[PDB]
Design a binder for this molecule. Structure first.
Ligand SMILES: C[As](C)(=O)[O-]
Lengths: 129, 132
């Protein structure tokens, strides 16, 4: 029931540039419950930040319109997206969970990158001879 | 000439609400199918969208290709792709054109008929029944 009983994994994908400039990204999240009892995702709380420092927040019921119940040792996956004003940004937040025993807690979704394949930062190394 | 060689079909889906305390936002996805019924390959070079919210407030999107590519659709082939858009109202309309170019080098447009974007059950269901 305690925190850490829920692990959040994330993958993203730059979808398309909407020049009017805006950038559409998609993100697929897998919420895995490794706790003793089942847990229900009741709310979400996103904090999005673009390359310019402009930040926005989204608080709502469930994810993609659903409040799934994730039994123990089960993984719930879903996909959504966000439109940024810049070709890259950072996104993090929390999910409002509720244990089978009626105990409410937050599942943490660590910061993750939103970026076009051309602006994804790469550190460069090489062989020393 | 080749204006009839391409047919566009589309389906949509309400993904998720992206609203902030005072700024309504609704994320939609759309899956376009571009069928080349021509006897020659056709390459999608540009797109030009006209997006309208429930109040007539429109936005215009113009760019090269779709989702990062300018696909070549050979004869008798249906190319599908998915993208999306965010509206400030739970209902809206989209329409526009794709700038196509044929193997022969000729440029023409593939029309994209207007289609809706709507959150499910925005309008209550109407009921019919076998009379008598
Ligand atoms: C599934 As999407 C992020 O292209 O609306």
């Amino acid at each position: 029931a305690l925190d850490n009983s829920i692990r959040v994994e994330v993958k993203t994908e730059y979808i398309e540039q909407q020049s009017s400039e805006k950038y559409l990204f998609s993100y697929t999240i897998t919420i895995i419950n490794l706790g003793e009892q089942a847990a229900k995702l009741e709310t979400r709380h996103w904090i999005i930040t673009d390359a310019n420092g402009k930040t926005s927040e989204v608080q709502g019921a469930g994810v993609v319109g659903e409040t799934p119940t994730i039994p123990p040792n089960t993984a719930y996956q879903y996909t959504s997206g966000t439109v940024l004003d810049t070709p890259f940004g950072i996104m993090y937040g929390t999910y409002g969970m509720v244990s089978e025993s009626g105990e409410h807690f937050n599942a943490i979704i660590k910061p993750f990158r939103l970026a076009t394949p051309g602006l994804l930062h790469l550190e460069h190394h090489h062989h020393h001879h």
